[PDB]
Design a protein around this nucleic acid. Structure first.
Lengths: 217, 216, 63, 475, 88
RNA sequence: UUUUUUUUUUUUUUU
RNA sequence: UUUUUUUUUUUUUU
RNA sequence: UUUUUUU
RNA sequence: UCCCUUGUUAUUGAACAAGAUUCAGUUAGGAACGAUAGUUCACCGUCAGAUGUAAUACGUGAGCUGGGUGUCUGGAGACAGUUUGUUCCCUAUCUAC
RNA sequence: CUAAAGAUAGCGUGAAAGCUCAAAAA
RNA sequence: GGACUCCUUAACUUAAACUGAGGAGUCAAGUAGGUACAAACCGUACAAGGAUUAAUUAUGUCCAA
């Protein structure tokens, strides 16, 4: 209202004598994403799942972007989108496959990027100039955008870009609203049995155990 | 990064080598600790409270040299104590510095006695009375000025620290278990209880009096 | 499936360990006969170096 | 003048650089490396780098050089050194060490008789046990039993007792796979213990002491430290009633060893003897606890003045300078599992003893009072693929805990390493299910003013202005 | 007392860092409040010299192309002045 | 300590 | 390290 | 596919 | 951090009132006239709107002009207004034995 | 306890008092 | 009675793409390549002509490529 925002460096040590002088986070300590305490069942993430389809020819790739780097993820995604990984790649057409991204909120950014990054939006003949929106706002409102824009600016500057862009799906949450596609995260399973006991239990004398229990009581 | 500065390029950064050896704040460090030092393994017996620290502080924490730890547990006029028949903990190391960390003493004091602080009140008409009962603290800042309701602080810090006032109402004592909490509370109080340098009507932390001033 | 090779976890082995200046300094002090127990030169302590050298260098007897 | 960069800026980037100094290369690799080994005696990295260089330069280095390098590496991690067990485990977990031991195993048949004591001493120092070479070393030891000196016999007995090989238990001294087992080596250290006693008995008839190296040195070149080590080795395996069949008077060996380890010393010299104090006190405590048939004859060897001195000043330096120092990976893993399983009653490095005991000589790994259980950790290499064994140090610890009446549960690294986080938690829960709580738990939480529990604090509370003239200022 | 540099003037000064709009160093003095220094008004920075240009900056800079036309020319090398050449 | 520079056309810093 | 934080501070040295 | 820290 | 309005509360030779230097925002609301025409400056009189800076081709001359220390009826960009629709002007002619 | 302590390096007052540092001991 | 750059140097405010000298390259009269965007810098086994082929160069090797 009348003062500058409270940055991430306000809640930690400052070490000028180092590369990472202060850690930066999208949200405060008391504001970080968390999971509900009552887990009705435990879940496990499959990292990535892939679906082929010979008849329709539309392939799907569901990824888990949990703790991954935005840049790297974007870079990887670009490849898939472009379809360069296939032998039969045609730059004229979009030879790519559909990509689904989840857990976008869990992304990471090295350095002082969370507190010293902004995004500009051009305006047609505006005196005020381009609109500037901070990254904290975007994280607060729509996390997916963080990845979306990185991918977009990564894609070639051509008329195909929109097409390639359309096929991209990003979600902040775990699951997706899609119908006919497998889930990256599935309920946990029972651990496998073991054919050996790694313990060697040896009981003591009952009389001495009772005497010790009585003494301690 | 990859850009030479003008000072380091042209001048070569000669300023750092243009200082005098006089008018120094502190004397130079004596270069006595030369080759010929013999290290030894020191050991200290601490009370059984340090067990609350756990392994995360003695083993998980990385250190230059190993830091062992053991717990000697023993089943249970004049307090004639000896080196036998009581529990304790052995903490041994090669670096004496590791055997003087404030966390080890805090682990015992927090769960045994805790910490305390005091604030002294001065000025004509400055009184710190009590409302019917706790938590309700009011302090009068001079004659004619309205009192200050200090219930917010006490409610904030409830169960963490407590405030006591002598009969006279000239002393504000604070007692707690949390170092941070105690300190914070004390400084919070003193922020609005700070004394004026001219009239000298307020409060101050002990062993840190304020200097008086006069108009020219 | 091969396409998604980037997502694979890897862990290279440890080529050599790392030690601190004080950790390395204590080693030569111990070797010279200034172990944790005391001064071997001043008094012959257990598992000393000179006794071990003789007993392990001349274990067999003369015929 | 001109700069190197300037010059280089006009030449191919891949152009090779001329050589400024050239000397003939080393013709003989073994002789070249033998002289280099003379300077590296404290730095493990130097030894490892030298071994790596020799391995890269030649495929079959000299066996004598390999043995010397292994002994040099083992010597650094001595008992009197400040190194920790974690530093030994991480060293064992290195590929180069595995390559060195594999090279030794490949040509194990070139092992000399005089190189066995050093190999055993290095094994004891590094806490590394193998079933690939120890069976061969024991063959040479037993073959040359009638030729080793008394100090070497005592040191070998102590090292083997520490390693936990040669015990009197039956069918517990076999190496190799179950379908291919080596010879049984049961009751090996007892032969050395009886040989030294037989030589001591015969020495009396001759009575020829002759020249001596030092006042503490005995006629046979023995040492009080060696005698105390023999006594401690016997105590570890519990062979208290060991006696010489040839002896007509039936004299116990432990009493003779204690007497010979104490006669030369005095009260003033005991304070600086070192390991002798711990050996004597631990042996006496174990003898008192187990109460063997020779208790009266064993307790009479140590003088009363020495016993009082050892009892008084014990909890200051003796108890702390003769125990492991540093971290422990296996201990930390089980501690993390216990913390995951919501176990706040486990005590790390906790001691125990009888009701009327004012001093404890043992510290359990993870002790729990609510369930009355003790957890032990073993990290030594198993005898074979699925045949682990408990170390000598833990062997007596288990007996003492059994006598005190505390249940013992040991965890083997060989089988624990073969599990994941899920599996480990499952197995630990199953193990704990067999020891339900009996006694009440004890808490060490933070103290607080509970009286003020009914108070409430409102943060987002606006300042009220009922009336204009304020009777009291509300901060 | 904003200053372009920092110095230890008291007997108990300590170099601290203040959580201002931006990370800013400073010196705090207990025996004298006037000695409180805050480094927040430095001199403007200059444009540095790229590193890759180092090789061609320092040291003796020799000419790129040499001179040979003056020492190459000869009558025998010219058809207009070749016949006049006489070896006898 | 090093790999990461004016990479100051954009993204990215994934070490 | 604690919402302590308009130019005010505590704890621990990571 | 990070290096270094004499004895 | 630009003349006023904000930073309770420690930079001050700051008793109060009235004042001086420096710094910070998520950039919020405001600042009146006249005489002499010496190309503009020190100063002068009134309401006291309360010590009131620069860049933009003198900002601005196909928008206007004045006593000196020319003309042009808007073709394309931009800006300000406005736009019914699938059909309601015309036309749109398989398969093959 | 022994040893050591600048004609006086930094605070302070009205001419004073008082404190601290160097040195010494540990 | 010449435009840029390399070494030396006269004048100037060790200023300016100025003014004027000594000796090498390029442009002028040079193509395509690199240097992000407009002669002068690097390289060229440097443009008679045609085709779906092989090469150590300035220089590059996360994405636009």
């Amino acid at each position: 209202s009348q003062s500058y925002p409270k940055g991430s460096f306000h809640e930690g040590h400052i070490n000028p004598f180092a590369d990472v002088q202060w850690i930066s986070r999208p949200f405060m300590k008391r504001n970080m994403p968390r999971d509900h305490h009552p887990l009705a069942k435990q879940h496990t993430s499959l990292k990535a799942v892939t679906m082929l389809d010979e008849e329709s020819g539309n392939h799907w790739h569901v990824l888990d972007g949990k703790g991954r780097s935005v840049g790297g993820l974007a870079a990887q995604v670009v490849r898939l989108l472009q379809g360069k990984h296939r032998v039969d790649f045609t730059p004229r057409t979009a030879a790519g496959d559909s990509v689904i991204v989840v857990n976008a909120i869990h992304l990471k950014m090295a350095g002082h990027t969370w507190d010293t990054k902004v995004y500009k939006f051009d305006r047609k003949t505006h005196p005020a100039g381009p609109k500037i929106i901070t990254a904290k706002t975007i994280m607060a409102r729509n996390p997916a955008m963080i990845l979306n824009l990185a991918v977009k600016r990564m894609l070639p500057p051509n008329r195909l870009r929109p097409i390639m862009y359309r096929k991209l799906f990003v979600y902040a949450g775990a699951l997706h609203p899609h119908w006919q596609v497998p889930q990256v995260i599935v309920p946990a399973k029972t651990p496998a049995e073991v054919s050996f006991l790694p313990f060697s239990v040896e009981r003591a004398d009952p009389v001495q155990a009772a005497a010790r229990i009585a003494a301690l009581g | 990064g990859g850009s030479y500065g003008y000072d380091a390029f042209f001048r070569g950064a000669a300023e750092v080598l243009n200082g005098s050896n006089i008018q120094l704040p502190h004397l130079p460090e004596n270069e006595e600790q030369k080759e010929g030092k013999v290290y030894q393994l020191h050991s200290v017996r601490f009370p059984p409270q340090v067990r609350r620290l756990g392994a995360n502080y003695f083993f998980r924490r990385q250190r230059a040299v190993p830091l062992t730890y053991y717990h000697h547990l023993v089943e249970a006029g004049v307090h004639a104590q000896t080196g036998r028949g009581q529990a304790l903990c052995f903490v041994a190391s090669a670096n004496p510095g590791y055997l003087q960390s404030k966390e080890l003493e805090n682990a015992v004091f927090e769960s045994t006695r805790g910490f305390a602080c005091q604030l002294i009140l001065e000025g004509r008409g400055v009184k710190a009375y009590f409302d019917p009962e706790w938590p309700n603290l009011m302090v009068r800042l001079g004659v004619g000025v309205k009192p200050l309701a200090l219930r917010r602080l006490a409610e904030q810090y409830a169960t963490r620290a407590k405030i006591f006032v002598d009969k006279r109402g000239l002393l504000l004592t604070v007692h707690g278990y949390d170092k941070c909490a105690v300190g914070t509370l004390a400084m919070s109080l003193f922020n609005h209880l700070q004394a004026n340098p001219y009239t000298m009507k307020g409060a101050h932390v002990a062993m840190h009096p304020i200097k008086k001033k006069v108009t020219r | 499936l091969i396409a998604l090779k980037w997502f694979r976890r890897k862990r290279p082995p440890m080529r050599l360990p790392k030690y601190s200046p004080l950790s390395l300094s204590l080693s030569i002090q111990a070797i010279r006969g200034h172990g944790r127990w005391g001064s071997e030169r001043e008094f012959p302590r257990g598992w000393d170096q000179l006794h071990l050298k003789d007993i392990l260098g001349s274990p067999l007897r003369s015929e | 003048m001109t700069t190197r960069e300037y010059e280089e800026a006009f030449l191919p980037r891949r152009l090779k650089r001329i050589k400024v100094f050239n000397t003939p290369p080393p013709s003989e690799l073994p002789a070249f490396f033998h002289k280099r080994l003379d300077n590296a005696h404290s730095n493990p990295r130097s030894i490892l780098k030298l071994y790596r260089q020799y391995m890269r330069k030649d495929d079959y280095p000299a066996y004598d050089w390999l043995v010397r390098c292994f002994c040099h590496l083992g010597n650094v991690f001595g008992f009197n050194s400040f190194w920790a067990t974690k530093d030994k485990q991480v060293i064992q977990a290195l590929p180069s060490f595995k390559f060195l031991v594999y090279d030794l195993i490949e040509r194990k048949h070139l092992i000399e008789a005089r190189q066995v004591p050093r190999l055993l001493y290095a094994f004891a120092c590094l806490e590394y046990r193998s079933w690939h070479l120890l069976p061969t070393l024991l063959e040479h030891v037993e073959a040359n039993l009638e030729k080793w000196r008394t100090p070497t016999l005592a040191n070998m007995a102590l090292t083997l007792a520490l390693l936990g090989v040669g015990d009197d238990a039956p069918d517990h001294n076999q190496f190799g796979p179950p379908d291919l087992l080596s010879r049984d080596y049961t009751g090996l250290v007892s032969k050395l213990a009886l040989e030294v006693h037989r030589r001591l008995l015969a020495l009396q008839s001759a009575s020829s002491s002759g020249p001596r190296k030092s006042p503490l040195h005995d006629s046979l070149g023995c040492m009080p430290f060696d005698y105390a080590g023999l006594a401690f080795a016997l105590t570890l395996q519990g062979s208290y009633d060991l006696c010489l069949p040839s002896d007509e008077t039936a004299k116990s060996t432990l009493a003779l060893f204690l007497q010979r380890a104490c006669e030369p010393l005095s009260l003033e010299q005991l304070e600086n003897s070192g390991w002798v104090q711990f050996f004597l006190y631990q042996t006496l405590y174990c003898v008192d606890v187990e109460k063997p048939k020779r208790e009266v004859e064993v307790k009479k060897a140590v003088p009363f003045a020495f016993q009082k001195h050892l009892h008084l000043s014990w909890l200051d330096k003796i108890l702390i300078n003769a125990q492991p120092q540093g971290n422990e990976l296996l201990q930390l893993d089980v501690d993390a599992a216990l913390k995951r399983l919501h176990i706040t009653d486990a005590l790390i490095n906790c001691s125990a003893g009888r009701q009327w005991d004012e001093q404890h000589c043992w510290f359990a790994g993870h002790l729990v009072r609510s369930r009355n259980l003790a957890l032990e950790y073993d990290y030594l290499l198993p005898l074979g693929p699925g045949r682990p064994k408990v170390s000598g140090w833990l062997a007596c610890k288990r007996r003492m805990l059994k006598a005190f009446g505390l249940n013992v549960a040991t965890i083997h690294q060989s089988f624990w390493s073969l599990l994941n986080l899920e599996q480990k938690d499952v197995q630990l829960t199953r193990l704990l299910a067999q020891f339900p709580p009996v006694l009440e738990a004890v808490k060490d939480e933070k103290k607080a003013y509970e009286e003020d529990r009914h108070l409430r604090f409102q943060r987002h509370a606006r300042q009220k202005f009922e009336t204009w003239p304020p009777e009291k200022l509300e901060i | 007392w904003h200053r372009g540099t920092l110095s230890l003037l008291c007997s108990s000064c300590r170099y601290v860092v203040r959580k201002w709009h931006v990370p800013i160093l400073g010196v705090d003095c207990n025996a004298n409040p006037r000695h409180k220094q805050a480094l927040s008004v430095p001199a403007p920075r200059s444009r540095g010299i790229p590193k890759h240009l180092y090789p061609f900056l320092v040291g003796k800079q020799y000419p790129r192309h040499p001179r040979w036309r003056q020492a190459f020319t000869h009558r025998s090398r010219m058809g207009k002045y070749k016949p006049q050449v006489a070896r006898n």
